[PDB]
């Protein structure tokens with residue numbers, strides 16, 4: 001069918017731009033030249049990151065950026081399009097550091113979207129930056145607009161969309177039109193900020209790239225998988241904040257959509273998006289991490305899963321104890337809590353004391369260091385088999401990942417994703433998706449196909465009775481009901497009739 005999107009972040013800090021070199025990994029660990037022609041062919045999008053919104057309320061580079069060096073770096077990325085006529089070099093505005101609630105630039109995000117005039121100036125600046133530097137689209141990663149700010153955010157996305165469409169016409173770019181994406185929340189707490197208006201958020205986008213990772217971290221009491229596909233009943237559960245969003249739904253409607261507590265998983269986030277009317281599966285992109293999250297002070301018994309831990313949650317990491325044995329990149333980056341897949345492979349291969357274990361419910365690997373009490377949750381080419389099959393079964397738009405520098409030197413994670421979507425000889429028809437917990441919620445946008453006998457006027461229906469009526473299958477919430485389905489509050493729309 002339609003090719004699945006494969007969207008990889010290229011993140012480069014300002015000091016690495018300003019000192020850019022392709023021949024000294026101690027200055028720039030992952031220069032553009034490491035994205036070989038083979039890797040460029042396996043990507044559909046590279047998200048160059050991160051730009052910001054400045055105090056003038058315009059899209060802008062970090063003001064410390066050497067502009068000549070920035071253009072050189074971007075030009076090296078756009079040169080890769082010679083190897084892949086489908087490849088887009090997007091640019092990403094925001095990210096956690098700039099745009100989180102306490103981030104250095106947060107007020108600029110709030111203010112840029114707040115009024116019609118601000119939105120026009122902001123939208124114009126986005127497209128100007130896109131054209132000036134040669135990017136192929138705009139990606140906005142505000143983490144995250146609050147419920148009160150959502151209407152302005154929506155209007156800003158709509159305005160950027162119109163300007164991008166104008167630019168596509170001006171440049172004759174119908175074969176590769178300029179695109180608009182966002183990085184969206186991948187867990188219900190942040191998602192609840194804008195969930196009620198999800199259809200309006202997604203309408204102007206080519207894709208919403210779900211950040212379906214960081215679902216565990218040092219801010220939680222209990223270690224867990226950070227990107228479990230399905231749930232493990234032995235693992236923690238979470239309050240379903242979506243049931244408190246301003247939806248206007250009834251008790252039965254909320255309960256059917258938002259089981260609580262629930263397992264915080266990739267499947268949960270995807271299904272939460274599909275449950276909403278007007279959110280098409282083809283626009284949902286599943287994010288995956290190319291890094292693991294490491295915890296210390298864990299107990300034994302279950303390989304470090306679901307244990308208390310003593311991992312500092314502060315930023316920056318508060319001391320110089322780099323306790324993730326074998327993680328040389330952690331020493332370089334002064335933080336033992338995150339390890340690239342590239343580094344995790346070496347840690348497993350060296351004499352460092354790790355076991356690689358597998359949770360067959362979550363379909364994800366983890367490392368356990370029994371002697372020191374360490375636990376690492378990460379993803380690999382095996383967990384990507386199940387996630388790729390899920391992407392195909394659920395008819396999602398594709399996959400996104402953070403970030404390209406964390407794949408191994410040979411690009412094995414990217415090559416695996418490309419194989420699972422595109423290789424003619426790859427067969428996952430027999431890949432068993434397991435018995436992990438699925439998110440069972442149903443909403444207006446994901447009604448299952450059902451059959452039931454036609455509703456009969458005058459018949460007295462007991463609680464739980466199912467009838468077909470006017471294109472849908474309905475269930476009584478109590479009994480005895482004689483009203484026509486949809487005419488009052490007694491009937492729940494539970495399914496749709498096949499065409």
Ligand SMILES: CC(=O)N[C@@H]1[C@@H](O)[C@H](O[C@@H]2O[C@H](CO)[C@@H](O)[C@H](O)[C@H]2NC(C)=O)[C@@H](CO)O[C@H]1O
Nearest residue numbers: 096097143211213214217218219313314315337
């Ligand atoms: C919002 C999301 O998808 N993930 C959030 C994390 O990005 C964030 O972790 C922080 O990310 C920064 C940007 O990469 C790092 O500089 C910072 O070290 C890191 N902090 C920690 C403790 O991991 C966390 C922070 O609470 O929130 C996630 O939700």
Ligand SMILES: CC1=[NH+][C@H]2[C@@H](O1)O[C@H](CO)[C@@H](O)[C@@H]2O
Nearest residue numbers: 095096097141183211214402
């Ligand atoms: C889409 C993307 N932007 C965010 C998000 O990924 O999580 C990353 C890893 O936690 C973080 O570094 C970044 O600021």
